[PDB]
Amino acid sequence: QFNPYGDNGGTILGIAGEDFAVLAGDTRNITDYSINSRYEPKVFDCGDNIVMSANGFAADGDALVKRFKNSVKWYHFDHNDKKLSINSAARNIQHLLYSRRFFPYYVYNIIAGLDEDGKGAVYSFDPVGSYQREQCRAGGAAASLIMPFLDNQVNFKNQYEPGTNGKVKKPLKYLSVEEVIKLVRDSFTSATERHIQVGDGLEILIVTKDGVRKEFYELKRD
Amino acid sequence: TTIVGVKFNNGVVIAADTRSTQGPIVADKNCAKLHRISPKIWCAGAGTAADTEAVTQLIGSNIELHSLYTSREPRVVSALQMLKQHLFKYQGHIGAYLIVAGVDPTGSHLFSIHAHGSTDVGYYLSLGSGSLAAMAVLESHWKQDLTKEEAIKLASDAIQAGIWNDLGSGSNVDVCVMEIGKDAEYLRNYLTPNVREEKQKSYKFPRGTTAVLKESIVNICDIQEE
Amino acid sequence: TSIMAVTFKDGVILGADSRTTTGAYIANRVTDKLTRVHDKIWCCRSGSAADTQAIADIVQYHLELYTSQYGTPSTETAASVFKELCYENKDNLTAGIIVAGYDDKNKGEVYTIPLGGSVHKLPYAIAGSGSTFIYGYCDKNFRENMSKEETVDFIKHSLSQAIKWDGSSGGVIRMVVLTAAGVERLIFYPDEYEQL
Amino acid sequence: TSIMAVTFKDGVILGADSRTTTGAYIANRVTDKLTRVHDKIWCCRSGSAADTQAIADIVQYHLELYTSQYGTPSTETAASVFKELCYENKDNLTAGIIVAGYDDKNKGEVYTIPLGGSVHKLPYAIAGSGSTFIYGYCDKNFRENMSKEETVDFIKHSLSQAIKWDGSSGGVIRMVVLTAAGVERLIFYPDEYEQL
Amino acid sequence: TTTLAFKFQHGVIAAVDSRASAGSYISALRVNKVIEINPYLLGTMSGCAADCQYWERLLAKECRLYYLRNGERISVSAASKLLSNMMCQYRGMGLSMGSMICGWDKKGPGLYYVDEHGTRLSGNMFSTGSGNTYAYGVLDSNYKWDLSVEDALYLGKRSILAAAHRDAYSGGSVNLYHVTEDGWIYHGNHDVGELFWKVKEEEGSFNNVIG
Amino acid sequence: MDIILGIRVQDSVILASSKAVTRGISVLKDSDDKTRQLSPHTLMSFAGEAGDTVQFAEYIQANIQLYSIREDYELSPQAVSSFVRQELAKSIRSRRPYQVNVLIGGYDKKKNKPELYQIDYLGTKVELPYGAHGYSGFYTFSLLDHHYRPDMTTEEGLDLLKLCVQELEKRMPMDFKGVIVKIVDKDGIRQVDDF
Amino acid sequence: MDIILGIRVQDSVILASSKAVTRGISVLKDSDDKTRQLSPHTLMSFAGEAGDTVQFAEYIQANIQLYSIREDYELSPQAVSSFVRQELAKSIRSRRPYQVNVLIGGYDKKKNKPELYQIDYLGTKVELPYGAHGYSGFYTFSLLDHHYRPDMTTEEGLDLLKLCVQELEKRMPMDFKGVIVKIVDKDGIRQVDDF
Amino acid sequence: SDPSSINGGIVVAMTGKDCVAIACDLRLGSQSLGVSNKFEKIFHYGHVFLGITGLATDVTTLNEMFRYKTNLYKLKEERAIEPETFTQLVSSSLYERRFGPYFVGPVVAGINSKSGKPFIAGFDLIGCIDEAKDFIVSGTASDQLFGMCESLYEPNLEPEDLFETISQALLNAADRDALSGWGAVVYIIKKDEVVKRYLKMRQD
Amino acid sequence: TQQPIVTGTSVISMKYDNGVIIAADNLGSYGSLLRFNGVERLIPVGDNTVVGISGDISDMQHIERLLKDLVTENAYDNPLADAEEALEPSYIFEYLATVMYQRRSKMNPLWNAIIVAGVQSNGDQFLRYVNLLGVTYSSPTLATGFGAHMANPLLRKVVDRESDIPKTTVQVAEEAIVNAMRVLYYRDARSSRNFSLAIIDKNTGLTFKKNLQVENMKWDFAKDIKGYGTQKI
């Protein structure tokens, strides 16, 4: 019997800062126990200061991104070159995903950028189109490895202030872009160690009011 | 898993990677797949890890008793025969896929054995999920009349092919050299091409960060006098 | 697998390819499927490698013990021991074996034992997945009382074609000659038999 | 079923057995599997009798309409119409067809169309359940530019062996000769071809 | 998931947990299981998040169009029925949605339960999701029509806590809503971890647990 | 849903229907009315798969109400029952059938006779003095077979109905949360508020 | 069978067990006592597959009674619970396991403490202040979590138990025909004949 | 259905400077239903500590079995069993049930009384030994624990620093697992003193 | 949904400093029967692209016809059909990728794995993969089927990352490809000795080599191998 779905592995990570946002993802592409590519870009600049990554079944991922990029183009045509806000992009993507409710896009999708007040924004989607704005989200193969670490090191969960013994929580101080990138690199380095589908390379897209910047880092190739 | 065996001029060498997995998760990054059946008979194992260790320890135990009974050094054909008859009896359910090698009074030997009990003879062999990547290297670079140095290089290169190209294999390369008229040299972590880079940050917490409810001394000592 | 055994004037010759496969992967390209169970009683093995090895080892043990007590066993006797194992354990075995041997009294003999564990004495026999493609060729080209050189050519040409068409067959063509003169091993490489 | 088509110096010859089976029962022992789709374009049929008849009838209709508009179609064109039907309806069909024809420009041509609906132009082709047993024989004995008499003997000997070993093949050996001279039908009975 | 809603003297209370799971893995600690359809309509969520979000945001479209055509706000009865009719079209196709439509209309407070089978039930009190049995225990033994807004808010809050504690697939935080004739009023997000200990001390409950 | 009973006495038809609705392992409601008035002198109770029941009942109700307005005339219970049967017989061979069993209790004003029709989801219609769907009849029919007369009063019909419910409450494993009872006679439809 | 509850208060253990037994679609009995006295101060209630329950309970009873006679001494509730657990852990890997869940309520005369042990058919033992098997806990644990104190009297324990049964009777689809309640304390075992 | 995830639970162990730590959650459940918040999964036989995750009946059974075997060992050997020796005993005992295994994920932790060397080990349900230098994880949130340990851990931590690291690894892993939590315990082990600490965590 | 009948095995390829190389054997297998020995599985499109196809042969022939029609269609009303508006490798691939993903989305796939090798207008190397699922990826080396398991490891030793491409000559690249084809003949049971090889260079253009054979094979060591363990004769 023909199975229309497949698993291309990979892992993605979105973090929302105070006035910035990052969307990272490894560059390894796989089937079963083989490597297809050590460098196959997974996070894309979709225009209007929005970055996107559809992780899971690569064919459905490429199709969704391609259709969203198209939706941005036609949004400009239809509404006098108006900038598509991150919240509007998120709602649009829900309807793209739910159009295939009974034959879904097999991907976990994340977009990142800035909201209309200039603050950092990350939105997270399931394969059938449920979505929500988040401060922090890991998606894909090693998502379960990374998220707990981010609960601890980004939202300071289970961390209290010394001397008080559980009475006073660690205050939720904001993180700089340099601090976030450190947590991203350590997350993927740790994921690479314990997850066979994670490795080769790490590509990070950083979004600020100035635009979209890229950073690349090597990961272990075994 | 990637394991290989290569014959050379005056002996035989075996090698293996050090990765163990359950699904897509790595359980052990530096696992030992090279086993000692007897001092100069070693085997590499792929498949179910508990099975490769258990079947190897059992036959190794019986080989030791046999050696004592006969006042002779153990032979590779004996270990081979005892392993295959044991595995055949369990009709493939004991998931041990082994490369058996060694030196004995008859000379140097190299065999493979599958879980259902079939054995094979060869100058170069490979087993495991990365056996295709390793065999590609072996088929490209192997030749008759290899030296000890050339064979170690070929064997480790074959393992590396598995490490880099097979997701079921990774981390380090273990080697064991069995030369005629010499002690077998077990080279644990012969290559270390996958050391983790320094982390960007230290995650050492301030003392008192974790909330505690109760403390108590655990009595590990025995009942005391007086 | 492509195996065959052929009787001729001076005795019998066994022939085999050298390919062992796990699906489409060639696990061993230089396999020896021609197996000795006694000095001048050999067998060709097809099917499960584990099963046919286990059987041949048990048979070799039986014939070694037979020899210690009653002297050299006949080829028919060896075929009977194979049969007993293959028939009684038919539910759990996958073994297609050809038994070939040389006596001085009976000369060259060939017995084929297919899956069910039945025995068939024949002038020549073919077996394995690749044998299907040479039923026509072998039936047309086989003659009784051929010479050693003619029999070698017959097996070489036959297995060449079986290898050509069968994906499960390949590598070198191994042969074992059984006569009064002794036991001779032959080998023929791809560059030789592919151009036939 | 044992079918084949062979090109030779003066054109092409089609050959077939005459057995149709429902399991082990022979439903027809005098079947005509050599089918005409145009004056000098014929086909050999294997697989489902219903499917291959339905296909051949549709093809004959297509080539009759082609002829009324554009004149005599080529053998390649006939093979393409067969292919289109076999490929596009591959999920619901079980048909193994060999297409053979004679042009004056192109002379004798043979196209084989296996289950998937792929097309393969060959000097000669064999198909059907019984073809497996003569891959070795046919590969060894086929030559290009044979005479009519040599080609008839080649097909007769080949199908004789296919019939001998295949239970799904039997009866008479039918043949159709396609040359510039015209269309000749031949038939060979069991007493003739069994003693070969 | 645990959701509840109940009618009382001064309107209707709506309370929900915040957990989302994928097998044993807790995929989200803080999901919003209440949708603000309009200032006088709320909808809870249980089942498939996508189905709940899509079909209840589509319900809000239809309720808005009702207001524009008629110039009047849609009733809770009519709104709940529109939604139940949507489910009936995809009847059998595999949707998974359990929700309560809460509001205040001309007849006073209204509460309807709707699920993927097309079921539509009017009632005073409902609870849905994996942890609904635990919430019903607290609700049934403490519910009165004579409840104050303060006590009613606490009851719904305490009922979700009960479920969050025992049900493995319920937890995270509690979202409270109070629906009046002047519209719904959000009464905050309440972490269960902090709420559990607070309730344990002040109420004396959960003696079995050590704190 | 679970339980629906019907009995035709001298001058009326009495329908009794359970109040329970269950989702998963939890009883969501214990006051559910499993019935719809099709016309002033015709009542239909129903039981079957979740959702389908109410959907089908309301669809039938709308059709009969449409007929009533168009002709300014009430269809006889027999005519309504035949219309309902046809819709179910139509439905059973559809892509997704409506899994609904019904009882139709009506008072024919022309003949001055009460009438009870039992129709299952296949479209199997029978006119009966008393009827039930599912397992209900297994417990209750022996009592009805014994005690039923055609000249019974409405009060005697209710007493025999109480005995049936008591037997159900004793021997059924499921708690159906009592029954809502309704009476259909010459004056129309009314509910017995204490049962 | 269906429902078994247990609660350990200050000076006693209270076990409540349903009275219903169902074969096919018919309730055969509404007064069944799903319990066995293992020793004068140890009571075991049980629920699971038909037949296995009583068989297992009586087998345990015989073993404890044999021990009592041999040593002229009553085993502690803890010791009995461990013996029972081992028998179930032994049973789960047998050819045909005994599909039985139990609660063991006992009063330890040495420590002067009531003790409640919950053991499922796999041999999963836990000591608890209150416990249940099957779906019973889904309805009742929220009430127990709220109202339970360790210094409760026997009378307060019975009142909290009544509230649990009332909640079950409201929200469970199955009619379990009420419960038999038994109290285990320093004076032994007694049944509450009005509940 | 899956025996290894019916009851839920986790165990994690870590090495430090002249010390080891082993920790576990306190939950026992019946799938979605939480049954007990006092089900400790760490046991000790002399100075050797054993944590066991998986099917609760087998956890209890194996504890009773290793208590049985270590008590006999001590009577015959006239000394307490060491971590290295106990690790082999666990492996041997699990493999004897190769085709009818205990559905468990054991974890050994302790310090050799003669050499003073810290030791940890993990096993699969059938005896394979994972003798790690850094850390061992087991249970329904093992993926979560691997991610926490692999990022938070660093070698040669002092006992009071190691406590914070292992506690935060357990707590945050458990808070991303539906079948783990409901309390937690941490053992800090030195050559001749062992401290046991119950942690405060969210109870959902 | 169908099943593949007549099938082609591995297609292998790699980038080098001035272009790309692609190779595939000439066999059309019918299960374990090595049925057809003269099948061309490399199909050139113009003078700048070669499409290598594995899997179902009937579907391959269908794709071959689509490409032939694509060339015909591109020339229509196109004065620059042999110049600026000629078909590019990227155009040909994206077309095939669109078709493959559409066919899988109708649950009626083309049962193939395809590699499009070529050189773009600006001289850039093009090498991308697509299969029956519509999955696409690019890498310095690409291979289908058994080639992915055996060829890629060998070819990645020559070009391990992007920076190794300019350092790799056409002689070294072809040597590696030819060696890989020998290894596949040793180890793949559905392979043949005869194969085709194509080189697309930005300077020397398209070079298509037919009737190549695997040579320099090692078999002599087989004579020393006897029995399966204890046998000496």
Ligand SMILES: *[B]([O])([O])[C]([C][C]([C])[C])[N]C(=O)[C]([C]C1=[C][C]=[C][C]=[C]1)[N]C(=O)C1=[C]N=[C][C]=N1
């Ligand atoms: B290798 O991949 O063949 C390797 C060789 C082994 C001797 C270390 N095998 C494993 O890593 C196996 C893979 C496997 C997974 C599931 C079932 C059977 C085999 N892993 C283990 O044996 C294993 C997994 N988790 C813990 C311990 N051991």
Ligand SMILES: *[B]([O])([O])[C]([C][C]([C])[C])[N]C(=O)[C]([C]C1=[C][C]=[C][C]=[C]1)[N]C(=O)C1=[C]N=[C][C]=N1
């Ligand atoms: B031959 O193909 O029959 C061959 C003969 C054997 C004695 C070496 N058998 C095999 O290669 C079998 C598979 C098989 C192929 C075709 C027909 C029947 C069976 N292989 C094995 O037994 C095998 C393969 N890999 C590892 C171990 N054993």
Ligand SMILES: *[B]([O])([O])[C]([C][C]([C])[C])[N]C(=O)[C]([C]C1=[C][C]=[C][C]=[C]1)[N]C(=O)C1=[C]N=[C][C]=N1
């Ligand atoms: B031949 O065996 O392929 C033959 C060719 C046919 C065109 C006359 N086919 C059959 O005899 C088939 C069965 C079959 C046998 C072997 C391979 C494939 C198919 N039989 C029929 O189609 C048939 C039989 N009885 C009645 C009607 N049709």
Ligand SMILES: *[B]([O])([O])[C]([C][C]([C])[C])[N]C(=O)[C]([C]C1=[C][C]=[C][C]=[C]1)[N]C(=O)C1=[C]N=[C][C]=N1
């Ligand atoms: B709740 O459990 O019903 C919850 C409500 C939803 C609105 C968030 N649903 C889920 O958690 C479901 C799984 C589930 C658990 C228990 C009962 C029923 C369903 N998960 C999701 O909907 C989901 C969606 N995307 C990602 C992860 N989980």
Ligand SMILES: [Cl-]
């Ligand atoms: Cl063999």
Ligand SMILES: [Cl-]
């Ligand atoms: Cl026909």
Ligand SMILES: [Mg+2]
């Ligand atoms: Mg990795």
Ligand SMILES: [Mg+2]
């Ligand atoms: Mg071959």
Ligand SMILES: [Mg+2]
């Ligand atoms: Mg015949």
Ligand SMILES: [Mg+2]
């Ligand atoms: Mg229990």
Ligand SMILES: [Mg+2]
């Ligand atoms: Mg919870």
